[PDB]
Symmetry: C3
Subunit: 215 residues, 3 copies
C-alpha cells in the first residue's frame, strides 16, 4: 500500500472499478488509513472486490458512479459515500431494510439512487472528510479536514465543518476567467511553461498566456 505519508498513489493507473471515473494526476495520499483508495475511500460502490461477483451478474442494474476530475488531491481518510440511501427511507413508517427471505412478499425495495458524485478539477479534499451521495464539487474547491459535505459545492469555494462555506478563493470575475480558460485541460508543455504563474495568485497573467498561446 503506502510505505510513507510522503507517498501519493496515482488513481487513474490503479483504480479498476468500472464505476470510478478519475482524471489525470489526481492522487490519494492514504498512508495513515492503510488501505487503497478503492477499499477505504470509496464506500458502498458495486463493482469492487468484496462485491465484484454481485456486480457481474447484473442483479441490481445501473449504479451511481463516482467521477473525479484531474489535478485533485485526496487526503488520507477521505470518504466518498455511495449507494444512496441504502434502502432506508425516512418517509416510510420503518427505516429498517426488511428482507424478502425473512419477511416474505410485500417488501418494497426502499433503495433509490441519489445521482452520481461528481468532483471537479483541482479539488483539494482534506483528511478524513466525508462526501455525501449525489454531491457535486466544483472546480478549484477546497474541502477542509473532517468536513461533512451534504450540498453541492460552488467552484473555488472553501467549505469547513458540517458544510460551512467560509469564502471563495478569488474574486467572482477571476473565478469565471479560470472556469473559462481551464488550465487543467491544456497540453502538458503549456502547463510546464506556465508553472511559475500557477504557483502564484496572478490569474490575469495566466489569462494573457492563454489568449496568446493556447486559445
Amino acid at each position: 500500500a503506502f510505505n510513507s505519508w510522503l507517498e501519493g498513489q496515482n488513481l487513474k493507473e490503479q483504480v479498476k472499478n468500472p464505476n470510478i471515473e478519475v482524471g489525470d494526476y489526481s492522487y490519494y495520499s492514504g498512508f495513515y488509513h492503510s488501505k487503497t483508495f478503492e477499499e477505504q475511500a470509496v464506500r458502498y460502490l458495486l463493482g469492487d472486490a468484496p462485491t465484484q461477483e454481485v456486480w457481474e451478474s447484473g442483479q441490481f442494474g445501473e449504479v451511481d458512479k463516482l467521477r473525479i476530475g484531474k489535478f485533485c488531491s485526496i487526503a488520507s481518510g477521505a470518504t466518498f459515500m455511495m449507494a444512496g440511501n441504502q434502502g432506508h427511507r425516512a418517509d416510510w413508517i420503518s427505516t429498517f431494510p426488511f428482507s424478502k427471505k425473512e419477511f416474505g412478499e410485500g417488501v418494497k425495495d426502499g433503495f433509490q439512487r441519489a445521482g452520481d458524485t461528481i468532483v471537479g478539477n483541482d479539488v483539494w479534499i482534506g483528511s478524513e472528510a466525508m462526501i455525501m451521495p449525489g454531491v457535486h464539487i466544483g472546480d478549484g474547491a477546497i474541502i477542509g479536514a473532517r468536513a461533512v459535505i451534504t450540498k453541492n459545492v460552488a467552484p473555488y469555494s472553501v467549505v469547513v465543518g458540517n458544510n460551512v462555506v467560509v469564502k471563495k478563493r478569488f474574486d467572482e470575475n477571476l473565478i469565471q476567467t479560470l472556469l473559462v480558460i481551464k488550465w487543467w485541460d491544456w497540453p502538458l508543455q503549456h502547463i510546464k511553461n506556465t508553472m511559475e504563474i500557477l504557483c502564484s495568485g496572478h490569474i490575469e497573467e495566466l489569462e494573457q498566456y492563454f489568449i496568446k498561446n493556447v486559445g
Copy 2:
C-alpha cells in the same frame, strides 16, 4: 468478521457481554471497520474480552449498560461511548486519573456513572456516528452520519451534525399513534401482513390494522 458491505450481523445472536441488551433483528453492518460490534462499536464497556478477567473480579462498581431496541439499523463505524467520565473530573483541580500505586493512598476515585444509554426501536444510526454516555434515543429516530449525540433524542426525530435537530419524521399525532401501537412488539406474522403499509407513509392504515387484528 465481514465478507462484504451488503452483509449485516444480527446483534442478539453474537453479543456476549451481559451489559449489552439488543432487541430482535437489530443488525450492525460494519464492513469498512473490520472488527465486530462488541470490538469496535461499543467502547469502554466493562465485560468485553480485554477486561473480562478484571471485570469478573468485581473490584469495580456497577457500570452503565447498553440497551438497544429491535429493528435498529447501525451503520459502519457507529460508536457507543461508555464508562461515563472514565475518572476524568472537569470540576476537580486536575482531570488526570492518578493511580494509587504511584501517588499514595490519598488518591480519590473520580469516576462517576452517566446512566444507561438506551436506544429505542426502529432507530437508524448513520455511519461513524458517536453516542456519548447517558444518552437515550427515542423510538423511530434517525441519527445522521458522523453525528455526535450528546443529549437525549426525541422519538422519530432526525438529528445531524453536532446534535442539530433537523425535523421530525411525521406529524406529532401520527407519531403518538406509532408510539402506542408499537409495531416492533407485534407477532411476526402481523408484521409480515402489514409489510406493504410499513413500506409506506400511511400510518392510520396500520393503526386500523392494529385496531382490528392486534388489540
Copy 3:
C-alpha cells in the same frame, strides 16, 4: 500494543521522535486504534519511522515540533496534524503539489511552517479529536471528543465540536491561582501530599499549601 482500554502507555518513556517533546506522567490510551502514539496520533511529522531516512539526510531542514506538557490525558484517536499546509496553497491558482520530476523546474514549493504545536499541562483531549497545525492549548484545558481545534485554546477552557468554546472550568481568579502555583511542576512528594486536595475543587487549599510549604 494495547492489551486493554484500561491501560495507557507512558509517553516520555516511549517516544523516539526527536521532533516531539512530552512531559512526565502524560499518557496515551489508544487501544481502540491499535497502533502507538507516534504512528497513529502524530501524523505527517518527519523523524518517525517511515520518514526517518528522509529526516536524517537534512533534506527539509527545520520542521514544526510537537510539545506536550505534564499530566496530560490523550484518549484513543486524538490526532495531531503536522507538516503545516503540506504544500497546498489556497492562495495560488492551483492547490496541487506539482513535482519537479513530472513538471518543469518552474515548480515553486508551496510548503509553509505553521509553528510548533504546543499542548500545556493537565490537558485532557477527548477521543478522536483533531488538533490542526500550529495550535497552542493552555494548561488545564479540556478538548471534547471528535472536536476539531483550529485556533488557540485558552487555559482551563472546555472546547467541543468545531472550536465551540463551552465555558471555563473555574472562576478567572482561581484559574490565575492555578497558573501561578503550577502544581504539576512541584516535587512529586508535594503532589503526593496534596492528593486529597487535587482530587477536589478546593483551589484555595492548594494555594495555602503552596504558600506554606512550596513557594
